[PDB]
Every structure is written in structure tokens, then in C-alpha cells.
């Protein structure tokens, strides 16, 4: 039942995003786990800002 | 002195360009009306939350 950061794993990379709920969520791939789950962007911004920035930098468009 | 060497606290990114060959941000600094350019990679390290706020606003489907 623990989900996201409550699983106690290290974030590895963001592999999706959705704001359909009213808040921005990231699908987080965790280190040494096949099972990605959603986390609040607000939480990821604080706990792993460079992983967040990497997700944005790979999809820049002009 | 330019960019972060002005020693001002970053406040908001108000623009971006790649014309130097690397991504730069136009940084508006708090208590200064003179914005100027900083490397994105430097902003990533020094003010990641300001970088993220900029990107978050421009995320689009």
C-alpha cells in the first residue's frame, strides 16, 4: 500500500507527466524497482530537483 | 560584472535563448530592474526551484 516516495526508494528518472487531477504528477521510475508510480511534482521538485529538470530539458521546443 | 557575478538573488526567469550555442536564461533579479543572461546549467545548480518554476509554466501538451 505505500506508494511513491513512501516506498523508501531512490528516484531514478521521470518517465511521464500528467496534470489531469488538478496538480502536476510525475510517473517516477525508482532505482532497482520495475514498478513506477505517480508522485506529486511539488514533492519531486524538493526531493530530486535535478531529476525534474532532466525531464524538462529533454523535451524543450522552440 | 554579469549574471550571477552581480551577486544579486535570482527572482524569476523571464526568457530564454540558445543563440550563444548553449541554453541561457534571461534572469530577473530581486531589487534590480536590469535582467541579464545566465547559463541554464549554472541556474540548474544555483537556483533549481527558479528553473523548475519557469519550466512548469511552459509545460504543454
Amino acid at each position: 500500500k505505500p506508494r511513491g516516495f513512501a516506498r523508501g526508494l531512490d528516484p531514478e528518472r521521470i518517465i511521464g507527466a500528467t496534470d489531469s487531477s488538478g496538480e502536476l504528477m510525475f510517473l517516477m521510475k525508482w532505482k532497482d524497482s520495475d514498478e513506477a508510480d505517480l508522485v506529486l511534482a511539488k514533492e519531486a521538485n524538493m526531493k530530486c530537483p535535478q531529476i525534474v529538470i532532466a525531464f524538462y530539458e529533454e523535451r524543450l521546443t522552440w | 560584472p554579469r549574471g550571477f557575478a552581480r551577486g544579486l538573488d535570482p527572482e524569476r526567469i523571464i526568457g530564454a535563448t540558445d543563440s550563444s550555442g548553449e541554453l541561457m536564461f534571461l534572469m530577473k533579479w530581486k531589487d534590480s530592474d536590469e535582467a541579464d543572461l545566465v547559463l541554464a546549467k549554472e541556474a540548474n545548480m544555483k537556483c533549481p526551484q527558479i528553473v523548475i518554476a519557469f519550466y512548469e509554466e511552459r509545460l504543454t501538451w
Binding site: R59, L60 | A16, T60, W61
Partner: peptide, 12 residues
């Protein structure tokens, strides 16, 4: 079924 991007505009 769109892909998210960060949409920037070049200064000037």
C-alpha cells in the same frame, strides 16, 4: 494522446 513538451520562445 499528446506528448508533453516545454514550449520556449527565443528572446528578441
Amino acid at each position: 494522446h499528446k506528448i508533453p513538451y516545454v514550449r520556449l520562445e527565443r528572446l528578441k
